[PDB]
Amino acid sequence: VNIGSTKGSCLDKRDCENYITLLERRSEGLLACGTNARHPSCWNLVNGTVVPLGEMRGYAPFSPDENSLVLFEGDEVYSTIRKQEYNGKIPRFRRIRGESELYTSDTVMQNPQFIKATIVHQDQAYDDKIYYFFREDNPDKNPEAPLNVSRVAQLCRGDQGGESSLSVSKWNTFLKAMLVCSDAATNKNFNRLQDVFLLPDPSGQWRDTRVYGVFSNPWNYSAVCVYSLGDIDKVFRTSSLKGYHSSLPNPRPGKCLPDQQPIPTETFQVADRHPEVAQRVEPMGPLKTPLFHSKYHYQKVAVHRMQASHGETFHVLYLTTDRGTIHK
Amino acid sequence: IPTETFQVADRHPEVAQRVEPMGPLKTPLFHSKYHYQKVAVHRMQASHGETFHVLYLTTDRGTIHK
Amino acid sequence: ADEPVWRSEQAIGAIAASQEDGVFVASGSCLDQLDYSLEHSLSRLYRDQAGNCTEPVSLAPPARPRPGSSFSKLLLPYREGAAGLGGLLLTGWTFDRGACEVRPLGNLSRNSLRNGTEVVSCHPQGSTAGVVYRAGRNNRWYLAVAATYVLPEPETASRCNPAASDHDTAIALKDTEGRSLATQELGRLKLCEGAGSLHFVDAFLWNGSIYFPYYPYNYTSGAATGWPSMARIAQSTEVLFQGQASLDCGHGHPDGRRLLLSSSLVEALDVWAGVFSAAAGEGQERRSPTTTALCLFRMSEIQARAKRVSWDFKTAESHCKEGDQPERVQPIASSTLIHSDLTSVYGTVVMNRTVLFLGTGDGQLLKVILGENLTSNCPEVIYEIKEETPVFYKLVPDPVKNIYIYLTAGKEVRRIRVANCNKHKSCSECLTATDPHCGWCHSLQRCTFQGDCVHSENLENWLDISSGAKKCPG
Ligand SMILES: *[C@@H]1O[C@H](CO)[C@@H](O)[C@H](O)[C@H]1NC(C)=O
Ligand SMILES: *[C@@H]1O[C@H](CO)[C@@H](O)[C@H](O)[C@H]1NC(C)=O
Ligand SMILES: *[C@@H]1O[C@H](CO)[C@@H](O)[C@H](O)[C@H]1NC(C)=O
Ligand SMILES: *[C@@H]1O[C@H](CO)[C@@H](O)[C@H](O)[C@H]1NC(C)=O
Ligand SMILES: *[C@@H]1O[C@H](CO)[C@@H](O)[C@H](O)[C@H]1NC(C)=O
Ligand SMILES: *[C@@H]1O[C@H](CO)[C@@H](O)[C@H](O)[C@H]1NC(C)=O
Ligand SMILES: *[C@@H]1O[C@H](CO)[C@@H](O)[C@H](O)[C@H]1NC(C)=O
Ligand SMILES: *[C@@H]1O[C@H](CO)[C@@H](O)[C@H](O)[C@H]1NC(C)=O
Ligand SMILES: *[C@H]1O[C@H](CO)[C@@H](O)[C@H](O)[C@H]1NC(C)=O
Numbered sequence: 001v002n003i004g005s006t007k008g009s010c011l012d013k014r015d016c017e018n019y020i021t022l023l024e025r026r027s028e029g030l031l032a033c034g035t036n037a038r039h040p041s042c043w044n045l046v047n048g049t050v051v052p053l054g055e056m057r058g059y060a061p062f063s064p065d066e067n068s069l070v071l072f073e074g075d076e077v078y079s080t081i082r083k084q085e086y087n088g089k090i091p092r093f094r095r096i097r098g099e100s101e102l103y104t105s106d107t108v109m110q111n112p113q114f115i116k117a118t119i120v121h122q123d124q125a126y127d128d129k130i131y132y133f134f135r136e137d138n139p140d141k142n143p144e145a146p147l148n149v150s151r152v153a154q155l156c157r158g159d160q161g162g163e164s165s166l167s168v169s170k171w172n173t174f175l176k177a178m179l180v181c182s183d184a185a186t187n188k189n190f191n192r193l194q195d196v197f198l199l200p201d202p203s204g205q206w207r208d209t210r211v212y213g214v215f216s217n218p219w220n221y222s223a224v225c226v227y228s229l230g231d232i233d234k235v236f237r238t239s240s241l242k243g244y245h246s247s248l249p250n251p252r253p254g255k256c257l258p259d260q261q262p263i264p265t266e267t268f269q270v271a272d273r274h275p276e277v278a279q280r281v282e283p284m285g286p287l288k289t290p291l292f293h294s295k296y297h298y299q300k301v302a303v304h305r306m307q308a309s310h311g312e313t314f315h316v317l318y319l320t321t322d323r324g325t326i327h328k
Numbered sequence: 329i330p331t332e333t334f335q336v337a338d339r340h341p342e343v344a345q346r347v348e349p350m351g352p353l354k355t356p357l358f359h360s361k362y363h364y365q366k367v368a369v370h371r372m373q374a375s376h377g378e379t380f381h382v383l384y385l386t387t388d389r390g391t392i393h394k
Numbered sequence: 395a396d397e398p399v400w401r402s403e404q405a406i407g408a409i410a411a412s413q414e415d416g417v418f419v420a421s422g423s424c425l426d427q428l429d430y431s432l433e434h435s436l437s438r439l440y441r442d443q444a445g446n447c448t449e450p451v452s453l454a455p456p457a458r459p460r461p462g463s464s465f466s467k468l469l470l471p472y473r474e475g476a477a478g479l480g481g482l483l484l485t486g487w488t489f490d491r492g493a494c495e496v497r498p499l500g501n502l503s504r505n506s507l508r509n510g511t512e513v514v515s516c517h518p519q520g521s522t523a524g525v526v527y528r529a530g531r532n533n534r535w536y537l538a539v540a541a542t543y544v545l546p547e548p549e550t551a552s553r554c555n556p557a558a559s560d561h562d563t564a565i566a567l568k569d570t571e572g573r574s575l576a577t578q579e580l581g582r583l584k585l586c587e588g589a590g591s592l593h594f595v596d597a598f599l600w601n602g603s604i605y606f607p608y609y610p611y612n613y614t615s616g617a618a619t620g621w622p623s624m625a626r627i628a629q630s631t632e633v634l635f636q637g638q639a640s641l642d643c644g645h646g647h648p649d650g651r652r653l654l655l656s657s658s659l660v661e662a663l664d665v666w667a668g669v670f671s672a673a674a675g676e677g678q679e680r681r682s683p684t685t686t687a688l689c690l691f692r693m694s695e696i697q698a699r700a701k702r703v704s705w706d707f708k709t710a711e712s713h714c715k716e717g718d719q720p721e722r723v724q725p726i727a728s729s730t731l732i733h734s735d736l737t738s739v740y741g742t743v744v745m746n747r748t749v750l751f752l753g754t755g756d757g758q759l760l761k762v763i764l765g766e767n768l769t770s771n772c773p774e775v776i777y778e779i780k781e782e783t784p785v786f787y788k789l790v791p792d793p794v795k796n797i798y799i800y801l802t803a804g805k806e807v808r809r810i811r812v813a814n815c816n817k818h819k820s821c822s823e824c825l826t827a828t829d830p831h832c833g834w835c836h837s838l839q840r841c842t843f844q845g846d847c848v849h850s851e852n853l854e855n856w857l858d859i860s861s862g863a864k865k866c867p868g
Contacts, residue, residue: 086710087710088710089710092579094579100573101578101579103579105557105559106559107558107559108559142346143346143348143354144346161573162557163511163574164491164510164511164512164556164557164574165494165510165511165512165513165566165568165574165575165576165577166512166556166557166560166563166566166577166582167512167556167557167560168510168572168573168574168576168577169576169577169578169579170559265491265511265557268557269557269558272557272558272559273557273558
């Protein structure tokens with residue numbers, strides 16, 4: 001179904017293609033967004049028809065090789081894609097569609113590379129969280145420290161914004177934590193998060209949702225670690241903040257508020273200055289160690305809970321190597 | 329050593345800056361997937377007077393690499 | 395002329411003259427709506443304490459070249475000629491983390507409509523200059539503000555600096571009709587780290603852009619750093635940096651005058667006036683008959699020489715202070731007027747001549763009329779403060795009576811006459827002084843204004859300067 005760059009063909013032909021980088025089906029039909037010769041736009045495919053919706057910044061990058069990420073939930077869209085080409089060198093996690101636009105501040109991430117995002121429904125609706133995974137520069141600059149580190153971040157879905165004119169449009173509930181995947185027996189660390197896969201529990205308990213992460217290291221060796229939304233959330237609401245040694249503000253940083261209250265300035269400033277929690281998120285169960293590690297270079301993971309002929313249940317991992325193969 | 333000088337040292341024995349390798353690009357002479365345990369070096373001259381450093385390493389497999 | 399003076403218990407921090415409503419002036423933690431005649435205090439605003447206007451904290455006024463402290467930061471009336479909708483007023487203070495509210499232009503006893511914190515400086519000694527304008531498809535009312543938001547806070551409890559992610563904010567765009575006068579993602583201009591503090595003097599609209607006169611300054615040290623400059627930004631809903639440029643006005647002084655005390659854009663002339671000064675010691679020892687000076691600049695040259703370089707502000711195409719340096723702009727040499735203690739300036743055009751009113755540290759109100767070459771003539775003294783009280787850096791013109799000008803000094807606001815034509819009796823004696831306001835009257839044989847003289851059509855009583863003394867009856 002050709003959706004050609006037929007929306008302003010370039011003179012001096014080089015690379016003005018319309019790379020389709022997004023496919024999402026909505027009630028209106030299949031949403032398709034593309035680069036459109038550096039003019040981000042979307043189209044709707046309903047009944048063998050291709051209806052253009054025009055330019056929609058944030059829905060598609062200007063170039064196909066860009067680190068993109070867009071998430072859909074209800075009538076809200078989130079994106080890591082810049083809305084303008086002459087934009088700064090600061091990647092952001094933004095709510096592109098919703099009550100108001102929110103963007104992450106300059107202080108929360110250092111050259112982030114987004115991997116995946118998800119909505120997490122907790123006990124009360126107003127406590128709903130958005131979690132997303134990524135790699136960024138290591139704040140530790142010592143020569144023996146590894147250059148990048150793996151993270152999970154949390155935002156309150158119901159974040160209103162701040163109290164001051166400067167913080168109104170910013171996310172005021174951002175918190176990030178380092179994701180650790182290291183072997184206990186050996187001392188082997190896999191610091192480079194490659195891919196994440198979420199597997200809800202049969203119990204329906206969000207706290208039991210499993211997060212499977214694939215990690216590699218400088219030698220391109222890999223390991224798979226499993227986390228629980230429960231453990232991650234516990235880290236976010238109980239850990240102190242790196243670099244902050246005084247009693248925390250009453251409404252705690254990263255904690256969602258009840259009746260559409262904006263986050264108090266005194267709370268936002270602590271969070272905005274110290275966004276990293278000090279305690280690390282480790283793998284599930286006793287002995288926080290990987291399910292397994294090998295000398296293969298894994299890049300993607302998918303998990304299937306299944307029952308054997310005799311009713312036994314097994315979790316089967318599907319991993320792609322960088323050699324174009326799959327391991328079961 | 330004065331008590332005041334000794335008490336700082338006794339509470340903070342580790343200096344902050346790390347010792348890195350010699351010369352520009354503080355990087356190793358080389359690295360490999362072999363498990364080396366001991367090293368001995370010989371600075372030597374070649375037939376034409378050129379000077380070379382030769383390292384002798386033992387692996388955990390009971391062999392020696394030159 | 396003379397004394398419809400208004401007094402205040404505290405020093406005046408700001409003054410803005412409304413068109414159809416009184417003259418507003420902030421003293422301490424209060425704001426007064428005064429009658430144009432400075433007779434009655436129509437309404438009053440108690441911003442901090444319930445009945446106290448007393449300064450909650452004592453501000454010690456440094457050297458006169460050095461900028462002063464104040465609790466009020468912004469006093470901007472706008473949306474005046476609406477016809478159907480009342481007028482509005484922006485009142486910004488150090489209180490509540492540099493908060494600013496939107497109030498009805500009039501009775502100060504009414505409640506504010508909207509308000510937001512971190513709009514202006516929360517530091518008494520910190521600069522703040524802003525201007526309202528309209529932009530976007532909705533043609534909404536915006537406020538472009540420049541301030542010194544970040545200063546070292548010794549007091550560990552009264553800390554009011556904005557968030558860490560806003561620490562480098564230099565100028566911000568505020569939506570006057572939105573949540574907390576909100577600034578969006580692309581609504582600010584950021585400081586270059588290390589550039590120290592920037593002291594913003596004024597903020598004004600010109601040729602589709604917003605200009606911000608300022609100078610690097612160390613508030614702790616109390617000394618100016620680099621060259622006085624001007625930042626240029628687009629009149630948009632988003633910040634679009636269009637350039638920066640230095641202003642050279644150190645003519646009759648060795649080390650120069652790297653301090654900017656006053657700013658005034660001559661409306662229908664496209665020329666900007668500013669009073670510059672060098673340091674007068676830490677006390678007042680280095681005082682010289684050349685320490686201050688009045689300089690005029692062509693807005694066209696200011697626009698042309700202001701490049702989108704990264705020196706005091708951050709840009710996406712370059713690193714701070716790594717590319718080319720800002721170009722210096724030269725003033726209109728003919729207009730320069732050297733002095734020993736100039737503190738304020740205001741300018742406009744009457745017939746077609748450019749009139750400049752200047753204030754001094756000795757309480758004088760000068761006046762210069764520029765020639766054909768825009769050359770500055772000897773300054774005439776219109777009023778003198780008996781107490782020799784330095785003149786507030788802002789000289790506000792009377793919107794109702796074109797013949798008046800509001801002079802503010804220390805704790806008083808006076809309604810001074812733009813010129814005293816009664817000082818001349820002879821027709822030739824008057825029309826030779828070259829004053830666009832004064833003109834001989836062929837009715838009662840005296841020199842006055844067009845309003846004081848029966849400007850009849852049958853008998854042209856009033857004689858202007860356009861003709862000169864070569865027209866008098868003699
Ligand atoms: C596609 O199907 C939907 C629902 O069946 C219908 O509302 C829509 O009109 C169809 N598209 C067109 C333009 O025929
Ligand atoms: C201002 O409003 C108050 C209360 O509404 C009123 O009492 C006062 O007289 C008003 N000011 C004047 C002088 O009109
Ligand atoms: C208000 O006045 C009282 C005395 O009437 C004085 O003690 C107080 O300092 C004033 N307000 C402030 C905090 O300056
Ligand atoms: C400031 O405005 C807010 C609305 O954004 C309002 O709730 C609050 O009461 C106001 N505060 C002041 C200074 O009266
Ligand atoms: C500002 O002046 C203070 C006091 O002299 C000094 O500590 C500081 O270094 C100055 N700021 C800079 C770096 O210019
Ligand atoms: C006003 O700005 C435009 C640039 O958009 C420029 O072309 C023009 O020369 C400016 N006017 C003056 C008097 O400089
Ligand atoms: C008014 O004065 C200005 C500057 O002195 C000059 O450029 C202009 O031509 C004059 N007006 C006319 C039309 O004489
Ligand atoms: C300066 O004045 C002279 C003589 O009065 C006049 O000829 C000249 O045009 C003026 N300069 C300009 C460019 O206005
Ligand atoms: C950290 O590693 C990632 C991926 O290997 C790379 O893209 C990034 O540039 C590195 N960080 C820096 C700034 O060197």
